[PDB]
Scaffold this active site. Structure first.
Site, PDB file in Angstrom:
ATOM      1  N   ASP A 108       0.828  -1.211   0.000  1.00 32.74           N
ATOM      2  CA  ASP A 108       0.000   0.000   0.000  1.00 32.74           C
ATOM      3  C   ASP A 108       0.861   1.259   0.000  1.00 32.74           C
ATOM      4  OD1 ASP A 108      -2.176   1.910   2.085  1.00 32.74           O
ATOM      5  OD2 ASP A 108      -2.594   1.305   0.014  1.00 32.74           O
TER       6      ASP A 108
ATOM      7  N   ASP B 148       4.765   1.735   7.394  1.00 31.64           N
ATOM      8  CA  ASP B 148       3.773   0.680   7.111  1.00 31.64           C
ATOM      9  C   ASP B 148       4.408  -0.278   6.084  1.00 31.64           C
ATOM     10  OD1 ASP B 148       0.516   0.223   7.323  1.00 31.64           O
ATOM     11  OD2 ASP B 148       1.246  -0.372   5.329  1.00 31.64           O
TER      12      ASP B 148
ATOM     13  N   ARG C 274       0.263   9.250   1.704  1.00 27.30           N
ATOM     14  CA  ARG C 274      -0.185   9.355   3.103  1.00 27.30           C
ATOM     15  C   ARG C 274       0.721   8.464   3.957  1.00 27.30           C
ATOM     16  NH1 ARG C 274      -4.317   5.883   0.140  1.00 27.30           N
ATOM     17  NH2 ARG C 274      -3.814   3.757   0.752  1.00 27.30           N
ATOM     18  N   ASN C 275       1.381   7.490   3.326  1.00 27.35           N
ATOM     19  CA  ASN C 275       2.295   6.567   3.995  1.00 27.35           C
ATOM     20  C   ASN C 275       3.744   6.987   3.784  1.00 27.35           C
ATOM     21  OD1 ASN C 275       0.118   4.988   4.751  1.00 27.35           O
ATOM     22  ND2 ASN C 275       0.293   3.679   2.954  1.00 27.35           N
TER      23      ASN C 275
END
Length: 275
Positions: free
Chosen positions: A151, A169, A155-156
């Site tokens: 993913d 993450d 935003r990560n």
């Protein structure tokens, strides 16, 4: 999996918890000052992953599991690194990682649409390309350790002090919009499907923090188009070659998409060509 406490264990009495950096259904992050977490006599702000009040043995097995993966992955400048842990008896399991002060990349970029000029306070093509390049470094590393993000989105990506950007993450989002077509269909997740994802992140970087596939419907015909060759149009701030790089990462055949190693070379070229 072994946990070398000599190397990783940090005293809870050297950790001072502050304001929550985030929540979740299972975990929760909270800001904190740790003294001498890097062998020097300095109070360093960090991010602490700890369990929620009333977390189960599997929530506990989970935080502990991710702790070993982090130890496994190892260190890289472009990832949110493990700094230490509190596992011994007499307190909460806590996984201390690097604290990134500016927050995720998307939210940050959106905030700078006013402070952005292609070339010369303000962001510029150099920033956008440097962040892209760094994320490719970070991904080439994870790929080296044989990890797959699953993913990879802005935003990560978290922004720290020097314009250093770090992957974690390793308002909401519709995660399907970052999924390679075989992943959506055949539900496979490989590094080559992370490159597709990487291509969508590049798109977010040059649209200064926008949501992919602007107002498009994610129906089963969306995934049809996408599987046939339909692709996003250039974001308002790309370079033609940055857009060409997006089209490359969005190649139908995962094997035909560039490898993160290839992208680190290419983005290094574009970056240096930027001057």
């Amino acid at each position: 999996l072994p946990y070398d406490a000599s190397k990783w264990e940090f005293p809870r009495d050297r950790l001072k918890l502050g304001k929550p950096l985030g929540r979740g259904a299972f975990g929760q992050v909270i800001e904190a000052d740790a003294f001498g977490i890097d062998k020097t006599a300095t109070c360093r702000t960090v991010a602490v992953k700890m369990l929620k009040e009333g977390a189960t043995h599997s929530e506990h097995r989970a935080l502990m599991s991710e702790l070993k993966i982090l130890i496994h992955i190892g260190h890289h400048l472009n990832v949110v690194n493990l700094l230490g842990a509190c596992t011994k008896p007499g307190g909460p399991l806590m996984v201390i990682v690097e604290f990134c002060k500016f927050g995720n990349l998307s939210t940050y970029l959106r905030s700078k649409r006013n402070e952005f000029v292609p070339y010369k306070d303000f962001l510029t093509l150099e920033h956008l390309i440097c962040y892209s390049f760094q994320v490719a470094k970070g991904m080439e590393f994870l790929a080296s350790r044989k990890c797959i993000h699953r993913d990879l989105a802005a935003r990560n990506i978290l922004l720290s002090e020097k314009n250093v950007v770090k992957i974690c993450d390793f308002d909401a989002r519709l995660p399907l919009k970052w999924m390679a077509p075989e992943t959506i269909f055949d539900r496979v997740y490989t590094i080559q499907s992370d490159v597709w994802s990487f291509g969508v992140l590049l798109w977010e970087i040059f649209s200064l923090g926008a949501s992919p596939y602007p107002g498009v419907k994610i129906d089963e015909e969306f995934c049809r188009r996408l599987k046939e060759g339909t692709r996003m149009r250039a974001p308002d701030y790309t370079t033609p070659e940055m857009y060409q790089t997006m089209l490359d990462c969005w190649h139908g055949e995962p094997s035909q998409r560039p490898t993160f190693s290839e992208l680190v070379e290419h983005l290094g070229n574009l970056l240096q060509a930027n001057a």
